[PDB]
């Protein structure tokens, strides 16, 4: 009826499986009817959307179209479905594994040189998106995919947002709880890329521990668990932390440990690995290692050197 040359109908894909199996939302595996190509379909949720096409959807789509890189998920196109009362699908390239389900699986085994590559790819991905003035804001094992040719992809830019540098007033409930950084828990609203690098640390560790390292239940109960690993939240250790409103929640103003290294030595053998992890899981965001200096850390430049993937 209406001319529509640049938005094909999603029926070009054959649905196959609810790949979230609950846990991603309404997200399907699917097969391009002519080529065989496998893809992921996300329906743009329209429940309680009173203000037309959702702004958060528009934002994600803007971001995905910008971010084009070997280690970021690829948005192929956006698809409609013919009305009479109609919907919109984001169409990603299908990735066969994700790092959560790979760590979960006991038959899967990670050699050191592989683990280096996984991290190398992840930080490269982070370098890119931050270089493009964008915060991911949802780092977690589950959102880190790997292709059958062993190429890692950052995925789920659903709560991603553009950033820059009056203070910045950014949404504070962001990042899953177990991978959420200190700053955000102490109510920080002008933050940037360090929040993702914090996440990369919890993931890095998880690559040996095979399970998320800091499984809290609330803001305070999380921030407790963090304090029981990275020291406690001292202005000595983090210049100006006192200045935060939410300072002295249950935050034991005395009860500190010292090191991450100790509780992880048991699992992480390599001396160089532990060191990277420590400069990533730093309390002060402005003294946390960055994407760039992290990639240059001797972990990625010593033996066994980083290698391609099968396991």
């Amino acid at each position: 009826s209406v001319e529509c040359p640049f938005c094909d109908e999603v029926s070009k894909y054959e649905k196959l499986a609810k790949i979230g199996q609950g846990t991603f939302g309404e997200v399907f595996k699917a097969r391009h009817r002519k080529t065989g190509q496998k893809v992921a379909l996300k329906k743009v949720l329209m429940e309680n959307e009173k203000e037309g096409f959702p702004i958060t959807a528009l934002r994600e789509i803007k971001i995905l179209q910008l971010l084009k890189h070997e280690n970021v998920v690829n948005l192929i196109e956006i698809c409609r479905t013919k009305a009479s009362k109609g919907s919109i699908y984001l169409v990603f390239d299908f990735c066969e594994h994700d790092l959560a389900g790979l760590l979960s699986n006991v038959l899967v085994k990670f050699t050191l040189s592989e683990i280096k590559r996984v991290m190398q790819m992840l930080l490269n991905g982070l370098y890119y998106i931050h270089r493009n003035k964008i915060l991911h804001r949802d780092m977690k094992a589950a959102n880190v995919l790997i292709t059958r040719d062993g190429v890692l992809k950052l995925a789920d830019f659903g709560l991603a947002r553009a950033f820059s540098l009056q203070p910045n007033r950014y949404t504070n409930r962001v990042v899953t709880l177990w991978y959420r950084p200190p700053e955000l828990l102490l109510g920080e609203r002008d933050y940037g890329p360090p929040i993702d690098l914090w996440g990369a640390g919890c993931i890095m560790a998880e690559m040996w521990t095979r399970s998320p390292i800091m499984q809290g239940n609330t803001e305070q109960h999380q921030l407790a668990l963090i304090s029981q690993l990275c020291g406690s939240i001292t202005p000595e250790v983090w210049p100006n932390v006192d200045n935060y409103e939410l300072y002295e929640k249950l935050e034991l103003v005395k009860g500190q440990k010292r090191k991450v290294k100790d509780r992880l030595k048991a699992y992480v053998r390599d001396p160089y690995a532990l060191d990277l992890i420590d400069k990533l899981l730093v309390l002060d965001p402005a003294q946390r290692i960055d994407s760039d200096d992290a990639l240059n850390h001797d972990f990625f430049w010593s033996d066994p050197m980083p290698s391609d993937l099968k396991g």
């Binding site: 209406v2 529509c4 640049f6 938005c7 096409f53 702004i55 528009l58 803007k62």
Partner: protein, 252 residues
């Protein structure tokens, strides 16, 4: 495609609107009109000129696919502005855009009972049209904002506030009054506006110490023969437009 939304004069002539019997004349008029409605509503809605500009670009591209005979400017423009403001992060509530669109288009008429069918419909009608705008554009909404290119390249020719202001003016009006945005890259257009602003201001940019002209430092395709053809064209429609030129005319 990187050149999907760029067209030749040949292509523009065979628009979807010509195809339903609309003179070239009438079409550029309908375009100019939707820009005015957009600028008017944008001002009352207190959105940035950028947001208006984004909305105008959507409108220009929209009508390279759809014909004005099937979607009128008065219908599209609020939907397009509604969207633009969300895309550029100055989102305006849907009610609010409907009210402001109404008073713009029907100043004397009364604001309908915001509980009626007449209203609950013209609310659904907009949301419907926004959806159609998105699909016609194939969800490509990041616009290359033509003001940055002009501000960039006024300072690369060390211009006064006056020559700067005059250029920005030419650029804004080139959006409303021409289909240059649908033919020439934001840098080429910027060069056009700066060039004209100089002619209008009797200013001359000195030929560079290399022997080359100022505009080669922005975009390598820009030739004096082109700039003269375009600044002529822009100036003609500026002369046609009542009181436009008055705003930048030297009265003193």
């Amino acid at each position: 495609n990187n050149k999907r939304w760029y067209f030749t004069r040949e292509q523009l002539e065979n628009s979807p609107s010509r195809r339903f019997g609309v003179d070239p004349d009438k079409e550029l008029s309908y375009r100019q009109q939707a820009a005015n409605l957009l600028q008017d509503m944008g001002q009352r809605l207190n959105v940035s000129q950028l947001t208006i500009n984004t909305a105008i670009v959507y409108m220009h591209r929209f009508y390279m696919i759809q014909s004005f005979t099937r979607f009128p400017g008065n219908s599209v423009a609020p939907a397009a502005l509604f969207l633009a403001a969300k895309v550029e992060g100055q989102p305006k509530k849907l009610e609010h855009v409907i009210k402001v669109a109404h008073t713009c288009l029907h100043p004397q008429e009364s604001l309908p009972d915001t509980r009626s069918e007449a209203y609950l419909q013209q609310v659904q009608d907009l949301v419907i049209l926004e959806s159609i705008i998105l699909q016609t554009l194939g969800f490509e909404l990041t616009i290359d904002h033509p003001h940055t290119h002009v501000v960039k390249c006024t300072q690369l020719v060390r211009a006064s506030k006056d020559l700067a202001q005059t250029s920005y003016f030419m650029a804004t009006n080139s959006l409303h009054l021409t289909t240059f945005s649908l033919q020439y890259t934001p840098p080429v257009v910027a060069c056009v506006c700066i060039h004209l602003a100089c002619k209008w201001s009797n200013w001359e940019i000195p030929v560079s110490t290399d022997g080359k002209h100022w505009w080669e430092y922005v975009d390598a395709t820009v030739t004096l023969e082109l700039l003269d053809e375009l600044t002529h064209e822009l100036l003609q429609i500026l002369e046609k437009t009542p009181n436009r030129l008055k705003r930048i005319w030297n009265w003193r």
